[PDB]
Amino acid sequence: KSITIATEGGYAPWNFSGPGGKLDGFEIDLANALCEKMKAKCQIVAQNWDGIMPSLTGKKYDAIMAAMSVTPKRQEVIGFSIPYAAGINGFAVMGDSKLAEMPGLGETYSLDSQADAAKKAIADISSFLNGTTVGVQGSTTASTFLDKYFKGSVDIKEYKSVEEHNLDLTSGRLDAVLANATVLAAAIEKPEMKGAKLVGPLFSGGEFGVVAVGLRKEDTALKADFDAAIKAASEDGTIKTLSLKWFKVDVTP
Amino acid sequence: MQEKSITIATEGGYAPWNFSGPGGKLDGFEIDLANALCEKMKAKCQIVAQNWDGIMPSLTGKKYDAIMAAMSVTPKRQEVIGFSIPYAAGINGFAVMGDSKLAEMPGLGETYSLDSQADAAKKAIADISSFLNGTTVGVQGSTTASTFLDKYFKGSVDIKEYKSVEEHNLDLTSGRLDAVLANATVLAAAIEKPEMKGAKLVGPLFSGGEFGVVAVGLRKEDTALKADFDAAIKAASEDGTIKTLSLKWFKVDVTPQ
Ligand SMILES: C[C@@H](N[C@@H](CCCNC(=N)N)C(=O)O)C(=O)O
Ligand SMILES: C[C@@H](N[C@@H](CCCNC(=N)N)C(=O)O)C(=O)O
Ligand SMILES: [Cl-]
Ligand SMILES: [Cl-]
Ligand SMILES: [Cl-]
Ligand SMILES: [Cl-]
Ligand SMILES: [Cl-]
Ligand SMILES: [Cl-]
Ligand SMILES: [Cl-]
Ligand SMILES: [Cl-]
Ligand SMILES: [Cl-]
Ligand SMILES: [Cl-]
Ligand SMILES: [Cl-]
Ligand SMILES: [Cl-]
Ligand SMILES: [Cl-]
Ligand SMILES: [Cl-]
Ligand code: NA
Ligand code: NA
Ligand code: NA
Ligand code: NA
Ligand code: NA
Ligand code: NA
Ligand code: NA
Ligand code: NA
Ligand code: NA
């Protein structure tokens, strides 16, 4: 019994690599814990974000564990296991800038249960970010969110990876970036991002949704195995433990 | 009773010498070495991050006491700062995308000392320079690599200078650059990361000359701190610590002698 799991490796603490390229993070530890429950040999591979879904359908590997949110558009092309996590997103800017004054600092809005307050916070941020350049990783729930609420207000610059937009924020090429808050909180702690800060509000639900294992639609048995393993790992505190270990928070839905 | 205290600056952008964990904790050969040297010196070790561009003005400006950021001793640097006895030596090479015609550069698997094999090194340089004609080569500005490129490849290649290794590596993978030149252990570690899939170390490896030896950067007249580091490095070289840490981090011996 063997399962090849693809991750990106550019999204710490979910998935990243050590100095010599060894894949590590919450999803690597989770993949191994799930495969132990499934009684299967676990092979974790790296695949760039852009080609992660065509390589799954192309059978280069069997599953995706790369902090992939379940979205109706993705559900048209691939299948998903039951969720193991949920995404919370926010903006980061250079802490010195006037943009650090973004309203709603640290306030959290669920796009599902607080649609009225979230759309007001979004409207305030959009007006506040008028004429700025915002970096985002292309083909993400974050680029979808920016396209939906900030398009004619902000100049949206899309990047292949988080690392790429973060370097353009620190050089001053970008005014702000939008990404998963745990990813940004980890990134701004790195020496290269000295001076960067999380600002304004945090958003969950809606576009961001929940994170699950990406699988081919026809792999019903593999989905059934992952579903039983995630249920069992949620039930014995395994996922919560790994989340606290990596994120110092609980990302479980 | 209480130990003295030293603040050591590193860059954090030069794995496996110095880099950081996902949450910014500084790690690598120089972090392990800094802590081992401070234990020998019986001093409290505080390791801080400082970008390469401002690393020397912040040392002279007394933001910290020492630099352990894989800094080579050069006559130009010796005019402005002091150095401890060396703890390592730099080996440099080019990296390109393996699919580039540039990957066939003469001659992979070879090493040339610019000090002892000057004749064979200049002959190999003359071949690489002609081979790289009209290409764009990325390099970290104010390094032994930028000095080496300025000396032998200026006028043959378009040299593009970057503030960090990570920046030129991203421009190599996007195709903005044809090649990069940097420390081979740094490039060998970098090409193993998912972002640098397809990149490869090509052509020969160079040591000595411009590259020289790595030592702790200190304020020019901070003689007590230099005396402290010199005794610790001597003791650390004597018990195999530097060789051990070198093998642990690079899987090659970087010690000079
Ligand atoms: C958990 C995260 N999901 C996003 C971004 C994931 C990008 N993953 C990666 N670069 N590895 C998505 O699936 O589009 C979020 O919404 O907060
Ligand atoms: C060891 C290395 N030294 C170079 C490059 C070091 C850059 N260091 C860093 N980015 N932390 C130099 O001192 O100019 C070398 O010559 O192979
Ligand atoms: Cl990484
Ligand atoms: Cl590693
Ligand atoms: Cl909710
Ligand atoms: Cl929590
Ligand atoms: Cl005291
Ligand atoms: Cl860390
Ligand atoms: Cl720390
Ligand atoms: Cl420290
Ligand atoms: Cl070296
Ligand atoms: Cl030219
Ligand atoms: Cl140019
Ligand atoms: Cl340019
Ligand atoms: Cl090497
Ligand atoms: Cl490629
Ligand atoms: Na925000
Ligand atoms: Na900013
Ligand atoms: Na020699
Ligand atoms: Na160098
Ligand atoms: Na610049
Ligand atoms: Na660097
Ligand atoms: Na050398
Ligand atoms: Na000195
Ligand atoms: Na002194």
Residue numbers in the entry:
A (entry chain B): 23 to 275
B (entry chain A): 20 to 276
List sentences from the manuscript.
Two Agrobacterium ABC-transporters and their cognate periplasmic binding proteins (PBPs) OccJ and NocT import octopine and nopaline/octopine, respectively. Recognition and import of opines are conferred by periplasmic binding proteins (PBPs) and their associated ATP-binding cassette (ABC) transporters. The PBP OccJ is associated with the octopine transporter of octopine-type A. tumefaciens while NocT is associated with nopaline uptake in the nopaline-type A. tumefaciens. OccJ shares 47% sequence identity with NocT and belongs to cluster F within the PBP structural classification.
The X-ray structures of the unliganded and liganded OccJ with octopine were solved at 2.35 and 2 Å resolution respectively. The liganded crystal contained two very similar molecules in the asymmetric unit as indicated by the overall root mean square deviations (RMSD) for all Cα atoms of 0.28 Å. The liganded form adopts a closed conformation whereas the unliganded form adopts an open conformation. The octopine bound between the two closed lobes of OccJ is very well defined in the electron density maps, and is surrounded by 18 residues defining the ligand binding site of OccJ. In OccJ, the pyruvate moiety interacts with four non-conserved side chains: Ser91, Asn111, Thr163 and Asn202, which correspond to Gly97, Met117, Ser169 and Ser207 in NocT. Ser91 in OccJ once again appears as a major difference in the binding site of the pyruvate moiety of octopine in OccJ compared with NocT, making this residue potentially critical for octopine binding. Indeed, Ser91 in OccJ plays a remarkable role in holding octopine in three parts of the molecule, including both carboxyl groups. OccJ displays a high selectivity and nanomolar range affinity for octopine. Here, we established a structural basis for the high octopine specificity of the PBP OccJ and defined the high affinity octopine binding signature in which five residues form the binding signature of the octopine ketoacid: Ser91-Asn111-Thr163-Ala164-Asn202.
